[PDB]
Design a protein around this ligand. Sequence first.
Ligand SMILES: C[C@@H](c1oc(=O)c2ccccc2c1-c1ccccc1)n1nc(-c2cc(O)cc(F)c2)c2c(N)ncnc21
Length: 834
Amino acid sequence: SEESQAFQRQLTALIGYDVTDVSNVHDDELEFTRRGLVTPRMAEVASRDPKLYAMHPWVTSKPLPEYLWKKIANNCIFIVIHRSTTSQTIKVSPDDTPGAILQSFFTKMEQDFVLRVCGRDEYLVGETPIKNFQWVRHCLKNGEEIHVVLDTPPDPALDEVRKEEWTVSLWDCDRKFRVKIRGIDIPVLPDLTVFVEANIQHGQQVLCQRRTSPKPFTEEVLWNVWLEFSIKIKDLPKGALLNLQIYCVQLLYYVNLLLIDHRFLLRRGEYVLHMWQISFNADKLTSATNPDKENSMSISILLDNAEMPNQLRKQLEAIIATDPLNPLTAEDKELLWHFRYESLKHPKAYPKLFSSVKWGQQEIVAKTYQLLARREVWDQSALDVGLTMQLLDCNFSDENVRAIAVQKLESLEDDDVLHYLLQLVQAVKFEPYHDSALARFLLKRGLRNKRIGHFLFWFLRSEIAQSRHYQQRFAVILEAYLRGCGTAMLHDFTQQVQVIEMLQKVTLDIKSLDVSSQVISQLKQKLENLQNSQLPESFRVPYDPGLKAGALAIEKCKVMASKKKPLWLEFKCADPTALSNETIGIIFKHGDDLRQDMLILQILRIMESIWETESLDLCLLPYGCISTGDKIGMIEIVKDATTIAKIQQSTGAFKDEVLNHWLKEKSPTEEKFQAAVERFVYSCAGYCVATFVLGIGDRHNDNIMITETGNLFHIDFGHILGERVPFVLTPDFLFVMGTSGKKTSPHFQKFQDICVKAYLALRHHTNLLIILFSMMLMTGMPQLTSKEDIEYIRDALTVGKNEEDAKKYFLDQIEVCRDKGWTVQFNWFLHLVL
Ligand SMILES: C[C@@H](c1oc(=O)c2ccccc2c1-c1ccccc1)n1nc(-c2cc(O)cc(F)c2)c2c(N)ncnc21
């Protein structure tokens, strides 16, 4: 009880927000959730395997791609086992496991040791086939030797968890719901007339709307009006958001209040809600009141209480085939609902079905629940992630509807959970209530696997550190996680948090003071002062928790000559068993919002996985990136890489030959050089298709880079998000491919061919990409997120069009880029002057 004060204070340090704080609330939902999440934590902690949790092996049940089979020699796998600076090689089959492989070593010169990967904290352990380990595939994909160091396993005791110590409406009537608007109050006015618009909302649909009369916008406006709504109290659905907004027209302020609380009670009493200052985005839905009580506006209220016909089946099937953004007419909705039992047979009909429910009626919602009660077809259906994701977006409130979504995610293996985790963390923003099946899914999955747990922490910490709209909720979830992750990890997270808090301090202090002599001088002094006392011996790399970064390579650290002034920092590896002498690189940056970088890079990983399922590898580089705080964070330095603008600038006269010449120098042999040119054709093709689909194609060439081995890759997506070519394919790139102006070439034929395959590949997962894009814009990018902005990707994916018309579309977009040529790239420098 005296010791728990320090532990709670330790948890507040890791979260960067006090969950015991009660200044910004009008109920106990957050405290109820803190208590509510105890059971799921303690359940999952009680059921987890200690040794497997300790070693967390990164394995899969998905097949090896048709591309990766060619790198197997003679059904053989060369593992290089190390032990005390003395190595040995072993012949291994693809279906072998570590236990069989260890017994082979002991024969050639028992069950105490474990086979750990060289460089990383990663363990080839368990009863998984050696073909289906992620690390075995990294070494096959990159073309590397599978190196592993024999040593003792990590002791489970280190991962000990601390001991802990702790339907319908009530007041139900056929009365019409009403709220008295007493008045509003702000200390300073920021536009002479104003009025309150009150809205009964369920899942971003206005069930009923009433307004006050207009009045002069003075510092204290008092209407004292009862607004009677049409909707009856018994007809209020759970999760019904009372949304209050101030207009002048122009929406200036907004706040929300849940009409039915976490204990199923109707909301009643005097409330003084502090509002947010200002098209739909996730912030607009929040149950959170404004914490800035001094400067913010406040509203004050009072609550006192047979077989189907042929044509129609075909008509219904037509509705079910359409894209997620395809509008349902009131005719369509009436059809879907009337034949809801037929609609229930088709899992793909579900989003549209539950979008056809009149959530303003108790009889209907009752019927909808009776319908969901018999879901044999839903449970037996093969997991569709895109379908599951629809049902967790802003259009669906209602626990049961969202619950069957989460029910399908349960089947995802750990590998697939990481792929979708960020989006799923963001989807918590669309939850009406703090405690939710989704929140509990995340917590559970985080506690079961350290890798998922690691990235959960940081994704949660990102939003806690900068979203006032949702910091309160996410913190109660992260506190819940950290209370079961283990003492080993809590110490590990603390190390990382303390390293980051140092390194951001140097970044911002140097940002205050193009490059000069004193800036180069002061940095090398600043990094020495931290390394000599403050900074640890070693710490986990947040963007990659296999790597333990050691000391600073102070020689290699430097500041960019840019307005934003990022810190390029470089670390030696703390692991002595690491194969090379190569450094772990990091870019700390203030000024950009790196949550936009996060979300784009995460879709690129999803695009790779899609491409893997249809045996394609377009050679993307989705480097590590983690947002740590407000306009601040961290990026993985991609090694042996330059910007294509530096290659050129060595005014604004761009040159066709130079990139091709640049590859000839950094690659010694021709067969390497051609291998670079090959890698360029894929990488360039993949980044063209991906950026077209995401609407972020038109980049200026400072924000496009290439590796010495010809791997093209884009950067700085946060910069862009906030005459026009569809994607960067400047002449310099085409010159590597052996074509100039009108001409064609054998690599350029291969470019168009892959681009077409990839594009059509992504189009086989249209719905998934539509929702990822939809949810990105709503949760990630406040700047632009209207109906038309979401509907960009429809036109990009050529929805409702066959593979021939679609092929023609993308090839024409390639022809545009050439027809304009250097035009746009030159126009950036021209715009700096103009
Ligand atoms: C532009 C370049 C760069 O960025 C610095 O910060 C920097 C700092 C001190 C000196 C040179 C630099 C350079 C640099 C410029 C020209 C040639 C070589 C290096 N850059 N930028 C990102 C990068 C990517 C993001 O998504 C977000 C972000 F904020 C930065 C990046 C990366 N991930 N990997 C490798 N290089 C990278």
